[PDB]
Structures are given as C-alpha cells and as structure tokens.
Amino acid sequence: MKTICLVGGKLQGFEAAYLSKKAGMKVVLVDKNPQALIRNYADEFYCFDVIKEPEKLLELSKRVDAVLPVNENLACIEFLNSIKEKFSCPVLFDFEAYRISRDKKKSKDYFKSIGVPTPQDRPSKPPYFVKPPCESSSVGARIIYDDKDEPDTLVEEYVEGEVVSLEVVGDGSHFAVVKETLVHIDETYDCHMVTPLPANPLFRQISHDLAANLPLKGIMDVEAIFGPKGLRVIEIDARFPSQTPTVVYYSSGINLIELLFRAFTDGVEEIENKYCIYEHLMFGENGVLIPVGEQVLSMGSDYGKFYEEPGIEIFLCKGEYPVFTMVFWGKDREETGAKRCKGLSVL
Ligand SMILES: Nc1ncnc2c1ncn2[C@@H]1O[C@H](COP(=O)(O)OP(=O)(O)OP(=O)(O)O)[C@@H](O)[C@H]1O
Ligand SMILES: Nc1ncnc2c1ncn2[C@@H]1O[C@H](COP(=O)(O)OP(=O)(O)OP(=O)(O)O)[C@@H](O)[C@H]1O
Ligand SMILES: [Mg+2]
Ligand SMILES: [Mg+2]
Numbered sequence: 001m002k003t004i005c006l007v008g009g010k011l012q013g014f015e016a017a018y019l020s021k022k023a024g025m026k027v028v029l030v031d032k033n034p035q036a037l038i039r040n041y042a043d044e045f046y047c048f049d050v051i052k053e054p055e056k057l058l059e060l061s062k063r064v065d066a067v068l069p070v071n072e073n074l075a076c077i078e079f080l081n082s083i084k085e086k087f088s089c090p091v092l093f094d095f096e097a098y099r100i101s102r103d104k105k106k107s108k109d110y111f112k113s114i115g116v117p118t119p120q121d122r123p124s125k126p127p128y129f130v131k132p133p134c135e136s137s138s139v140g141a142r143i144i145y146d147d148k149d150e151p152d153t154l155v156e157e158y159v160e161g162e163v164v165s166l167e168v169v170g171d172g173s174h175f176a177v178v179k180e181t182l183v184h185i186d187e188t189y190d191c192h193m194v195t196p197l198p199a200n201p202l203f204r205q206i207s208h209d210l211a212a213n214l215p216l217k218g219i220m221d222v223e224a225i226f227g228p229k230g231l232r233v234i235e236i237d238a239r240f241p242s243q244t245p246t247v248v249y250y251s252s253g254i255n256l257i258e259l260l261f262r263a264f265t266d267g268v269e270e271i272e273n274k275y276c277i278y279e280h281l282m283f284g285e286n287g288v289l290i291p292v293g294e295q296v297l298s299m300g301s302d303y304g305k306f307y308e309e310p311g312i313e314i315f316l317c318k319g320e321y322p323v324f325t326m327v328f329w330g331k332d333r334e335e336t337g338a339k340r341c342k343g344l345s346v347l
C-alpha cells in the first residue's frame with residue numbers, strides 16, 4: 001500500500017485525495033488552515049505551514065511514497081522548488097512547466113512559439129473577453145461589450161464554442177494524452193458540470209506537442225475552445241486539476257493519480273468508454289437546487305462523501321448552504337441520465 005502526501009486541502013486536494021483512494025492509497029494532508037476543506041476526508045491531517053516549518057514536511061517525506069503539491073500559492077510553490085532536492089521521496093510536480101502555465105501571457109507566447117492557435121490579443125471590435133494573467137477557477141474572467149475599458153489584464157477576442165479540457169501526463173520522454181472532457185460554464189464562466197467527449201485527433205496532437213516541447217515531467221491540462229473558425233487554445237495549467245479527473249476516471253478507466261505517480265517512478269507510455277455526468281448543485285432556501293461553480297464550492301467548511309450506490313457518488317460540501325457534488329456513470333448517456341435522476345430523487 002502506497003501513501004501520498006498532499007500539500008493543499010481545497011479543491012485540487014480533494015480531487016487528488018479522491019483518486020488516491022480509488023487507487024487504494026493512504027492520503028496524508030498537509031495544510032496551514034486548521035479547518036482546511038478536506039481535513040476529514042484525508043486519512044491523516046497535519047496542520048502546519050510548509051514555508052514556516054519545512055523540516056516537518058521533509059520528515060513526512062521519509063514516511064510517504066510521494067509528495068504532491070495541490071495549491072496555487074506561488075510563495076509555497078516557489079519555496080518547495082528551493083528545497084525539492086532535500087525530499088526523501090519524489091515531488092510530483094514540474095516547476096518549469098508551472099512557471100509558464102501560471103502566467104497566461106507567457107503561456108500565449110509559448111503557444112505562438114510552436115504554432116498553436118490561440119485567441120487574438122487586443123481585438124478592435126466587441127465583445128472582448130477579459131481576465132487576470134495569473135488567477136484560476138475563472139476568478140476575474142468576464143465578458144465586456146463595449147470599448148469603454150485595469151492593470152496587466154488579458155484582453156482577447158471572445159471565442160464562442162465548447163470549452164474542452166485534455167490532461168497530459170509526461171515522464172520527460174513520453175507524453176500520455178488522456179481523455180477529452182466538456183467544461184460546462186455558468187453565467188460567471190465558472191464550471192458547474194463536466195462530461196466526456198469523443199477523441200479529437202487535432203486537439204490530442206496539439207496537447208501532445210505542448211507537453212513534448214517543455215518537456216513535461218508531471219501533469220498538465222490543456223484547455224481549448226472549439227470556436228467558429230477552429231480550435232483555439234486558451235490556457236494550460238501544469239498542476240493537478242479539479243473536476244475533470246473524476247470524469248476521466250469513469251469515462252476512460254484511467255486514474256490520473258496512478259498515471260502521475262508512474263511518471264516519476266517507472267515512466268509512462270503514450271496512448272473504457274463509459275459516460276459520466278459530474279456536477280455541483282447548491283441546496284438553496286426552501287430546497288431549491290441551484291447549479292454552482294468551483295468558486296462557491298471552495299467557500300465550504302467541510303467536504304466528504306455523502307452517499308454511494310452503483311453508478312452514483314454524492315459528496316457534501318458543508319457551509320452557509322450545502323453544496324452537493326454529484327457523480328454519475330453508466331455504459332451510455334441513457335443509463336447515466338437514469339442514474340442522475342435516481343441521485344436527484346435521493347435529494
Ligand atoms: N505554505 C503552505 N503550507 C500549507 N498549506 C498551504 C500553503 N499554501 C497554501 N496552502 C493550502 O492549500 C490550499 C489551497 O490553497 P490555494 O492558495 O491554492 O487556494 P486559495 O483558495 O487561494 O487558498 P486560501 O484559502 O488560503 O485563500 C489552502 O487550503 C491553503 O491553506
Ligand atoms: N478568449 C475567450 N473567449 C471566450 N471565453 C473564454 C476566453 N478565455 C476564457 N474564456 C472562458 O473563461 C473560462 C476561464 O478562463 P481560463 O480557463 O483562461 O482561466 P483559468 O481561470 O486560469 O481557468 P482554470 O479554472 O481552468 O484554472 C474558460 O473556461 C472559458 O469559459
Ligand atoms: Mg486556469
Ligand atoms: Mg479533461
């Protein structure tokens with residue numbers, strides 16, 4: 001039995017913990033917040049700040065099989081980079097790839113350098129899409145309908161179409177492009193639902209090439225919009241993602257935690273077909289169910305399993321109003337929809 005140490009106990013941490021459990025691994029959480037979101041979901045919880053008390057983490061690295069950073073605190077990531085040679089186990093992270101992926105402008109320069117289409121910068125006609133250069137979860141992302149308009153903000157052409165995610169796990173030499181998923185967006189451009197998509201040869205080749213040219217040793221997701229004039233890559237994020245890996249697990253049978261672990265041990269090779277519906281629903285006043293995105297879920301107080309039966313998993317995120325994360329799967333759309341209705345009827 002393997003043990004994984006996660007640094008970060010919010011949504012990235014949940015995803016990693018969830019898949020580690022599916023892989024039969026013990027989950028050790030480190031987080032500076034005494035009431036970190038997934039503290040009760042982990043098998044062990046150690047509350048400390050890794051920057052303030054690095055020896056505690058280094059000692060933990062002697063007792064676990066891998067350390068996985070699952071936060072986007074640049075201070076933390078940069079600090080871990082500075083001490084990574086001192087770890088007694090592998091650190092499942094690509095610090096160079098993250099340096100590029102975290103900065104949307106640097107990422108776009110990277111896309112351009114290898115001929116990957118990406119939205120036009122500073123268009124002359126509305127609507128414009130605007131976003132910060134270094135946020136996540138669509139924080140600060142908004143549409144602007146007139147040139148009546150902020151610091152180092154990205155201003156792009158608004159590309160209408162499906163938002164599609166693809167994960168790649170690299171071992172430095174081989175790059176495993178995994179499973180396409182559809183990102184369902186809400187009025188805030190946050191993601192409230194994920195479903196799987198059939199293979200797209202072009203997107204897979206593009207994603208392979210983005211990983212290969214680094215070269216990636218770690219995990220990265222690639223996001224593109226299938227726009228009216230073709231695919232446009234909007235961003236990359238070289239860290240363990242939330243939401244999509246659960247859909248990847250059920251739709252493809254691939255456990256991204258197992259794959260990432262393999263990349264830092266035995267290596268990876270390049271290359272199920274079920275349906276899966278993954279969504280978040282808030283239980284509002286008078287029991288009115290409301291779709292919400294990650295920004296809402298990340299404001300919760302306690303996150304863990306609520307219910308399971310065949311083809312149905314439900315997680316409850318406690319807080320001001322409860323948020324349920326619902327996972328449904330089956331052989332096809334029809335059966336999965338049937339499981340969705342059963343899951344909803346439970347609520
Ligand atoms: N140096 C650190 N040591 C331990 N845990 C950390 C450190 N930096 C961040 N974390 C934890 O990782 C989790 C995710 O952090 P991240 O900064 O990615 O998201 P966030 O929502 O901005 O976090 P916060 O709740 O601090 O605003 C948080 O629970 C946070 O407490
Ligand atoms: N140029 C664009 N045209 C249209 N929609 C866009 C554009 N850029 C971003 N979006 C929308 O905004 C959302 C968030 O943007 P983006 O993924 O670039 O930021 P992020 O917050 O770093 O995302 P992530 O949560 O994946 O870390 C996208 O999923 C998409 O719905
Ligand atoms: Mg992002
Ligand atoms: Mg995906």
Ligand SMILES: [Mg+2]
Nearest residue numbers: 137138223235
């Ligand atoms: Mg994104």
Ligand SMILES: [Mg+2]
Nearest residue numbers: 101235236237
């Ligand atoms: Mg990015």
